[PDB]
Design a binder for these strands. Structure first.
Ligand SMILES: [Mg+2]
Ligand SMILES: [Mg+2]
Ligand SMILES: [Mg+2]
Ligand SMILES: [Zn+2]
Lengths: 440, 213, 267, 122, 98, 255
DNA sequence: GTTATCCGCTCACAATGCCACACGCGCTGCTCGG
RNA sequence: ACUGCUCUUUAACAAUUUAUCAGAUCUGUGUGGGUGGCGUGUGGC
């Protein structure tokens, strides 16, 4: 069961069993919407656990690893501060004076230990040298956007050479784009970290209780553990250097969660390999873009090995009885329901399971003109996918005309080919009109 | 304890899965409830054969106050102070008239308790209900005189065939004697069960003798 | 489970609301007296405030309390505050208009942690605790999922205490009536905030509200998906008393629309 | 049960010399120092020193039961006489440690003195 | 099980207190609990007040009659019948187990 | 006055029961109109069984006649529909029976709070056994205005805004629960001092206007005339506040 | 000297598609436990 | 050994200012509900 107020808690995200309370009190659709009181979960569709998100009230502000280490660093250009010093002040190994008080300290100047403590001796107030993430947050929130924007604007028509003018026009472009949009620079430093919906990082089980811990849960556990420990330390009188190092560690963990790339690695236990961060779930050949969004796996198709079959006409193509009977199954169910040969859908499933002597006539009927798509594994150019009319054959091979197999750049060395069935009427007619072999 | 509230009823639990229902008329019109509260009432109806819920508890029917006094008043429950009758107006105002067999008993000084403690406790348990303890006499005229307390009537004209009683208060006390919605009167007309009449104590009610002199 | 201080607060609010309902059905027992502009304050306010203070001190004899009447009763501790309004919309309870509520919220280190409002006439109980959300009689609260200023309903309040902004205010409303569908006006800030968090109205805004008239509702609308702000997008609304609240889209649209109509005194 | 003021850290009373620096670092399993810039440590200030010292004194004087209960939270009962009841902690106590708890006994709520061992979750 | 279920009883009334203590020891006997002495401790005065519209320039004095019941054999019937049979208001029932 | 009112009350009872029943299917623009039609249809059944001679007048069905065209039934099965669309519980059913070119029977029933106001011409308007004695205000000092923004008459938008601006400069505060019929019932029962709205319709205020007039109040148009029946421009309340409101609102009108 | 200029220094950031198969997936001495 | 010596006949009350004439419903259980994520390697084309 999801531990209460945890990375899968039902109270925060949603009920596990469909339309059923966690504690087990409510169990019927008669209560769609109410929350229980033994465990306090809103009894609705389990699907919602795919949607609801969580948040973590970070015990202290922390930088966002993207806007810090994505050349050119957004914060750097937004503050006219070299990235090295910004990194040295984020990770608690420097200081930064803000507001530039009576002392001869500039609002952007940094400090190390001895300079900081010496100025502290020389100035007990009017001199605020803060260090760490929240220091940068205050530095941002104190900065006036359009003021410095128009300052650099009036300044750019004054100076030379064009290298300074180039960097400065880049910066004023950044500031203008910023103030134009509704964004506010202090948002660039996270204060409340949103945690992905649970279902999208599912703890997948094994045959027993060896649940495969998806690395996202590992990173989140690390971060929330740092946060809890840091809050507990903040409550116990806060030994200064201790809390300093702890905020540094928490910053590191959050950076690793947003991106395991920079700042070393965050390797899992005894498995010498980095953990899939959030960015690692988006970039690359396995990121959602090139893996699920741009090209997505199709449920309504099949593949086989291609023989020659040199008898079929130029638009026809062989098709094994097994593959057609597996593909066109819904069409077969529809035809059986039409002729009434099986009143219920489950009866039709049974009939297809037994392959009565009528199902073959039905199948032969349902594809008499229904086109089909054949595809080669490397689809270099447009002809890599063509449309044919299937003809039922035996065996398991996929016959195809020799001419188009010279077009597919397809030999018969065992090269495999994938099949696809356009199911909507638009797609059928489209394949017949556009990608049928007698067109290309 | 309760489980669920509706616009027409609420569902109660009595432990050991003992489930009851309370209808809308059984409840006070303004008694706010919430899953978890420990409500009390009187088990007025049962249906050991109904297709659904079977135990019926109420708080509005007049026997509720009888039972409340019975659990409060140690005199009652041993019938040393027999509860004669009681009329109600749910949650708003309920008059009650009792008798007593013992002579040294002060029903006004006992059933009320000490400086208004017993009847006050019953009221605050009932959820803000005005209560009027009064002595039951065995004469309908004097009884209804007692009923509209606080009041004072100097022209009691009874007619037993018509079930009518002209019981008219002193001129000026009317706004208090009748009371809002005629509650003090509405309950009286129910306590004795007679179609009363409270108009005028010193004029235009004695047509015969009045117009005579 | 249930947040502890939330349980104490909801019990206290329940008792106060029962007393309120008791005083309601008697248009005789109310003995009010005028204190501000076009509004009275009744003895019922004092009675309910007394009940709330006593019930709180029963299980918390040291917490600081805040109220429109008693100002700030500084308990022996000063990090746990209880902002209380024993009545929101006393004007309505004067005329016995059955739309009002009791409001109780708890501030920890300045941050509101638990909050409840209670409408005894419909027996509605808006609870809300930080990091766990807001509930209406046992149902979650997500606020209106509207995505623009079209077809929306806008709850508001007229500044009967600061009528100078009225003209400006009027213009604002006028401008808003160009786009939104209809307005709502109940004379009860807490219930307006609740309805916003309830998804009953798709946005609320008011000029010059009292601190203890939103400190309970603001956590409701927060944990019900909505956001709150001043009329310039900042967080100073707790001091100016100038509030806008609702789901992020409608709040952004309202702020964009009002950026011009507003006056510099408010910003 | 044993807790720590702050885990992962250890406190020493060393001095500042590169030899002693290594001698601290040349031990079986430690990371670097915790302070100023690496290779130039910084001392935990004397104020924090006496603060943690007072904390240590207080925890050494009185072994005290933590994991307390907060006034106004519902809780079950594991008591013999009152098994499988549940009530709200009406008033908490520490030295007496007996949890004044309101619960439904003969109808209306009543306060009881159910001791810590007779208190369930929260 | 464990023994000391000790019931204190503040009160401002007289006859209902005798009735309550009597029915309490009655329930204890209907259970079998070794009901201790009710032991009516010495009555305690209380100067009360009238926090309403006062006089012009009264529940002022009252006598709290106290009761100290004890049940030290709480089997099922004791707590069952006790939580079943409610007791009238006006009396305080702060009990202890320890 | 007894049988007509009893029939109308039973009709409003059935309507409110069905409305509250259907109020418990949470969903997040059409099914509201569906349950509207259903309540209207069961109302129609109530009209057909009892007194099949009278004629019905609804915002939805227009006017459906029988034989007795002298008895019109003006039944709005829902006022302030948008509230029920948004689950905001402020809505009621408004039954009216006009006889001889004049309203005679009026009922407004909120099923949520169970508010059942009845009204017969002459003998007055009761509520649950109580008599609505209007408002006690003699002017626009500290008063409340059951104000209604014309979300269907956007042509008079700016005029109405200037009017309510002058008012709020003079008056104290507004109220708007988005239910014309209930607004009229409330200003009738002294719960809000004065009322005024722009561009209304007969099926909306048909009962509320009588509820108000029977409560020692008046109902008129923005020019004191009596064409507010169809011009949709209504101001109502006890005569003192209505006079005090018209005297301020006349000099910025357009109709 | 300084101000702008430029050139080597270091780091981020990409590596065809499918298919199939196989294998594995913390731990560990501290902590909860009788 | 050395305070103690009748006090005089069981409770001492709340409800309370327009307005009244007391003024449709106790039916179910038809119906469904009741291996995989990643990494790596290997090959193939
Ligand atoms: Mg090949
Ligand atoms: Mg207030
Ligand atoms: Mg309508
Ligand atoms: Zn549950």
């Amino acid at each position: 069961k999801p531990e209460r107020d945890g990375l899968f808690c039902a109270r925060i995200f949603g009920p596990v069993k469909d339309y059923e309370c966690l504690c087990g009190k409510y169990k019927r659709l008669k209560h769609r919407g109410v929350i229980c009181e033994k465990c306090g979960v809103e009894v609705t569709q389990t699907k919602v656990r795919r949607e609801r998100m969580g948040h973590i009230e970070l015990a202290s502000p922390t930088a966002h690893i993207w806007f810090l280490k994505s050349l050119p660093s957004r914060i750097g250009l937004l503050l006219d501060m070299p990235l090295r010093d910004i990194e040295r002040v984020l990770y608690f190994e420097s200081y930064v004076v803000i507001e530039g008080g009576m002392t001869n300290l500039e609002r952007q100047q940094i400090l190390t230990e001895e300079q900081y403590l010496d100025a502290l001796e020389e100035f007990g107030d009017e001199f605020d040298a803060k260090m760490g993430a929240e220091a940068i947050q205050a530095l941002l929130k104190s900065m006036d956007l359009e003021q410095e924007c128009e300052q650099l604007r009036e300044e750019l028509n004054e100076t030379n050479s064009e290298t300074k003018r180039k960097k400065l026009t880049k910066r004023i472009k950044l500031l203008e784009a910023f103030v134009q949009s509704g964004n506010k620079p202090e948002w660039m430093i996270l204060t409340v970290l949103p945690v992905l919906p649970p279902d999208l990082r599912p703890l997948v089980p094994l045959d027993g209780g060896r649940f495969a811990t998806s690395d996202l849960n590992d990173l989140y556990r690390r971060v929330i553990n740092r946060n809890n420990r840091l809050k507990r330390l903040l409550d116990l009188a806060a030994p200064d250097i201790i809390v300093r190092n702890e905020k540094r560690m928490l910053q590191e963990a959050v950076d690793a969660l947003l991106d395991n790339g920079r700042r070393g690695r965050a390797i899992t236990g005894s498995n010498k390999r980095p953990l899939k961060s959030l960015a690692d779930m988006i970039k690359g050949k396995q990121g959602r873009f090139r893996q699920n969004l741009l090209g997505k796996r199709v449920d309504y198709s099949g593949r086989s090995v291609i023989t020659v079959g040199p008898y079929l006409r130029l638009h026809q193509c062989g098709l094994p009885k097994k593959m057609a009977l597996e593909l066109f199954k819904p069409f077969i169910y529809g035809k059986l329901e039409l002729r009434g040969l099986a009143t219920t859908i489950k009866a039709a499933k049974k009939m297809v399971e037994r392959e009565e002597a009528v199902v073959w006539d039905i199948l032969d009927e349902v594809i008499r003109e229904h086109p089909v798509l054949l595809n080669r594994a490397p689809t270099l150019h447009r002809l890599g996918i063509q449309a044919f009319e299937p003809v039922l054959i035996e065996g398991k091979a996929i016959q195809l005309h020799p001419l188009v197999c010279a077009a597919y750049n397809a030999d018969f060395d065992g090269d495999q080919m994938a099949v696809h069935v356009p199911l909507t009427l638009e797609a059928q007619l489209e394949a017949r009109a556009l990608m049928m072999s007698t067109n290309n | 304890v309760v489980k669920k509230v509706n616009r027409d009823n609420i569902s109660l639990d009595l432990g050991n899965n003992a489930e009851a229902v309370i209808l809308r008329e059984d409840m006070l019109p303004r008694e706010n409830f919430r899953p978890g509260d420990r409500v009390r009432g009187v088990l007025y109806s049962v249906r050991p054969e109904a297709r659904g819920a079977q135990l019926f508890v109420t708080r509005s029917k007049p026997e509720m106050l009888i039972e409340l006094f019975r659990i409060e008043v140690p005199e009652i429950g041993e019938e040393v102070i027999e509860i004669k009758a009681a009329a109600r107006d749910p949650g708003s105002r309920a008059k009650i008239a009792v008798k007593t067999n013992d002579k040294r008993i002060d029903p006004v000084g006992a059933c009320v308790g000490m400086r208004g403690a017993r009847v006050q406790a019953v009221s605050t348990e009932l959820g803000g209900e005005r209560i009027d303890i009064v002595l039951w006499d065995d004469n309908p005229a004097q009884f209804v005189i007692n009923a509209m307390a606080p009041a004072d009537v100097a022209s009691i004209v009874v007619d037993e065939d018509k079930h009518t009683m002209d019981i008219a208060v002193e001129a000026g006390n009317l706004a208090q004697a009748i009371g809002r919605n005629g509650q003090n009167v509405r309950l009286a007309s129910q306590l004795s069960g007679w179609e009363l009449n409270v108009m005028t104590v010193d004029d235009l009610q004695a047509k015969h003798q009045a117009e005579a002199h | 489970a249930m947040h502890p201080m939330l349980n104490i607060a909801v019990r206290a609010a329940r008792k106060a609301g029962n007393l309120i309902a008791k005083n309601y059905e008697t248009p005789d027992a109310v003995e009010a007296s005028q204190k501000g502009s076009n509004d009275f304050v009744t003895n019922v306010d004092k009675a309910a405030e007394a009940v709330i203070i006593d019930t709180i001190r029963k299980s918390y004899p040291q917490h600081t309390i805040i109220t429109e009447e008693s100002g700030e009763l500084e308990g022996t501790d000063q990090d746990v505050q209880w902002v209380i309004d024993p009545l929101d919309g006393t004007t309505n309870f004067i005329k016995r208009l059955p739309h009002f509520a009791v409001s109780i919220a708890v501030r920890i280190k300045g941050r509101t942690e638990v909050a409840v409002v209670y409408d005894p006439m419909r027996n509605e109980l808006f609870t809300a605790t930080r990091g766990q959300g807001a509930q209406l009689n046992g149902y979650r609260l997500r606020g209106s999922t509207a995505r623009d200023l079209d077809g929306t309903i806008l709850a508001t309040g007229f500044p009967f205490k600061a009528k100078q902004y009225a003209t400006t205010y009027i213009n604002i409303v006028g401008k808003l009536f160009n786009e939104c569908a209809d307005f709502r006006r109940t004379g009860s800030a807490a219930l307006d905030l609740a309805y916003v968090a309830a998804g009953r109205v798709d946005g609320f805004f008011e000029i010059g509200l009292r601190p203890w008239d939103f400190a309970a509702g603001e956590l409701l609308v927060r944990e019900a998906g909505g956001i709150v702000s001043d009329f310039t997008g900042g967080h100073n609304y707790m001091l100016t008393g100038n509030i806008v609240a609702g789901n992020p889209r409608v709040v952004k649209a309202m702020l964009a629309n009002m950026r011009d109509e507003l006056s510099d005194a408010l910003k | 049960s044993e807790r720590k003021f702050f885990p992962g850290y250890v406190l020493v009373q060393m001095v500042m010399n590169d030899a002693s620096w290594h001698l601290v670092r040349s031990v079986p399993r430690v990371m670097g120092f915790i302070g100023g810039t690496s290779d130039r440590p910084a001392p935990i200030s004397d104020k924090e020193v006496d603060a943690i010292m007072n904390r240590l004194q207080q925890v050494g004087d009185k072994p005290r039961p933590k994991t307390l209960f907060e006034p106004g939270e519902m809780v079950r009962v594991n008591d013999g006489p009152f098994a499988d009841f549940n009530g709200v902690v009406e008033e908490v106590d520490y030295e007496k440690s007996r949890l004044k708890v309101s619960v439904s006994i003969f109808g209306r709520a009543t306060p009881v003195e159910l001791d810590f061992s007779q208190v369930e979750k929260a | 099980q464990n023994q000391r279920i000790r019931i204190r009883l503040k009160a401002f009334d007289h006859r209902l207190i005798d009735q309550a203590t009597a029915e309490i020891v009655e329930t204890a006997k209907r259970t079998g609990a070794q009901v201790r002495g009710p032991i009516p401790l010495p009555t305690r005065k209380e100067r009360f007040t009238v926090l309403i519209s006062p006089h012009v320039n009264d529940q002022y004095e009252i006598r709290t009659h106290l009761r100290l019941v004890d049940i030290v054999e709480p089997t099922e019937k004791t707590v069952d019948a006790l939580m079943r049979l409610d007791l009238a208001a006006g009396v305080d029932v702060q009990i202890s187990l320890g």
